[PDB]
Amino acid sequence: APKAVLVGLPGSGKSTIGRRLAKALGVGLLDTDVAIEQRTGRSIADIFATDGEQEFRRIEEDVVRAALADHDGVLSLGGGAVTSPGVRAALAGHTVVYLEISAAEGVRRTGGNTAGPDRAEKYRALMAKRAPLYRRVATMRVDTNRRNPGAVVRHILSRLQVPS
Ligand SMILES: O=C(O)C1=C[C@@H](O)[C@@H](O)[C@H](O)C1
Known part of the structure; x- marks a missing residue:
């Protein structure tokens, strides 16, 4: 089972934090989007x-299901995988770290440069849709709105310790 399953919206810095966290932990990084292409x-x-x-x-x-069983490191979940009821079901009992940002902050960072003339409107709609699903499956929620990546990672590590 992964040490951490990362979830977040575009603009949350998920890729960046995943790389950083896996390096801090000394563990493998599996990006589900990359795995689909590889497979x-x-x-x-x-x-x-x-x-x-x-x-x-x-x-x-x-x-996603195979990785949840096989991967012991950090697993970076594709942004829409949470939309599948079976993914939400398979996630239960895992450490799920939600990289949480406001829609205003998402739009500030992106947005929705991640459609044509309406892409901002669709991005607002994407996050209205996904963000409750991330809230649902999270076991750890991390406000990345103003933290830097190293601080987000330091915060995560201090809440993922192992005895003794
Ligand atoms: O938000 C989404 O639905 C997606 C995000 C990427 O992770 C890819 O899985 C793909 O572009 C679908």
Whole structure:
């Protein structure tokens, strides 16, 4: 089981914090988005655009599930994997670290540069949709709104200790 499963919206710094946290812990980093491509020989765009979301999510959940069983390090979850009820089910009992930001801060950082003229509106809609799901599955919630990456990581490590 992973030491930490990281979840967050675009703009939360999830990739960056995952790399940093895995380096602080001395553990493997598995990015589920990368694993799908490594396993399918197809890009995310190509799967998502060709097969459609439902099939992408089916593929994702299978990869998420395997990693949850196999990976002992940090697992960085693709941003929409939480939208699948089976992912939310499989997550239960894991350490799930939610890299939490406000929608205003998301928009400030991105936004929604992560669609055409409406992309900001869709990004506002994306986070209204995903953020309650991240809240639901979290076991640790970390306000990354104003912390730097090293501070977020220091905060996480102090709440993931192991006896003695
Ligand atoms: O928010 C999303 O739905 C996605 C985010 C990325 O992690 C990829 O899994 C893909 O672009 C889908």
